[PDB]
Write a structure and sequence with these properties.
Two copies of one chain form a homodimer. With about 100 residues, the first copy, chain A, is mainly beta. The first copy, chain A, is built from one helix and nine strands. Chain A starts with a strand and ends with a strand. The complex binds the ligand O=C(NCc1ccccc1)[C@H](OCc1ccccc1)[C@H](O)[C@@H](O)[C@@H](OCc1ccccc1)C(=O)N[C@H]1c2ccccc2C[C@H]1O. Chains A, B: Homodimer, whose active site consists of two apposed aspartic acid residues.
C-alpha cells in the first residue's frame, strides 16, 4: 500500500500472538515495543532519541507480522511511549520512502 | 526519488543558505534542527521523544530546501541529536511510505 503522512503512519502488527498498534518510523534504527514478555534470552541495551536514553531489553530473531507481511529481526522492549517499527524491520517488508 | 532503508535516510537540506544533513523521519510529527540562528520571533514548544521531553524554539514560515524540493513551514530548533525532517514538511514534498 501507499501510506500518506498527513497523520502518523500507524499500523497493526502481530507479535507473540498479540495484536498491537505500531508506528512505521524511518527515523528509528531499530524496533522498540512497550514492556511485554518475549521468549528467549535478552541482552540489556541503551538507546537514545529525543529527550535522552532509555534502557531496553534486546531480543533477537523475533517474528513479527506487519500489515500481513512476515518479518524477522531484533526487537527491543522497554519504556517507549509508543510502539515503533524501525528500519531493521521496515527493510524486510520492502518499505521505501518516495517523493 | 525512491529511498530504501538499509541505511539511515539522510538527505541534504538547504536552510539559511547553508547545506546540512538531515534525517527523513516518518516518526517525527515536526521538523527539528540542531542549534542555529533563524530570522524572526520564536514561540516555545515542548516535544516528547523516546527519552523524554526537550524544549525547542518554534519558527514559522521558514524556507527550507529538501533534496531540491522547496518547502516553507514551521521549523523547531533545539538540542536534538540530529537534524530531523518531520511529517509537517514530508507532506509538503509529497513524501509517502510504500511497500
Ligand atoms: O528517536 C529516534 N531514533 C532513535 C531510536 C534508536 C533505536 C531504536 C528506536 C529509536 C528518532 O528520532 C531521530 C533520531 C535519530 C538518531 C538519533 C537520535 C534521534 C525517532 O523517529 C523519533 O523522531 C520519534 O520516536 C518515535 C515516537 C513517536 C511519538 C512519540 C514518542 C516517540 C520521535 O521522537 N517523535 C517525536 C518528535 C520528533 C521531532 C519533533 C516532534 C516530535 C513529536 C514526536 O512525533
Amino acid at each position: 500500500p501507499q501510506i500518506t503522512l498527513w497523520q502518523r503512519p500507524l499500523v497493526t502488527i502481530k507479535i507473540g500472538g498479540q495484536l498491537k498498534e505500531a508506528l512505521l518510523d524511518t527515523g528509528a534504527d531499530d524496533t522498540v515495543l512497550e514492556e511485554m514478555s518475549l521468549p528467549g534470552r535478552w541482552k540489556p541495551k541503551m538507546i537514545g532519541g529525543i529527550g535522552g536514553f532509555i534502557k531496553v531489553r534486546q531480543y533477537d530473531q523475533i517474528l513479527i507480522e506487519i500489515c500481513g507481511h512476515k518479518a524477522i529481526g531484533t526487537v527491543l522492549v522497554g519504556p517507549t511511549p509508543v510502539n515503533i517499527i524501525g528500519r531493521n524491520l521496515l527493510t524486510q517488508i520492502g518499505c521505501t520512502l518516495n517523493f
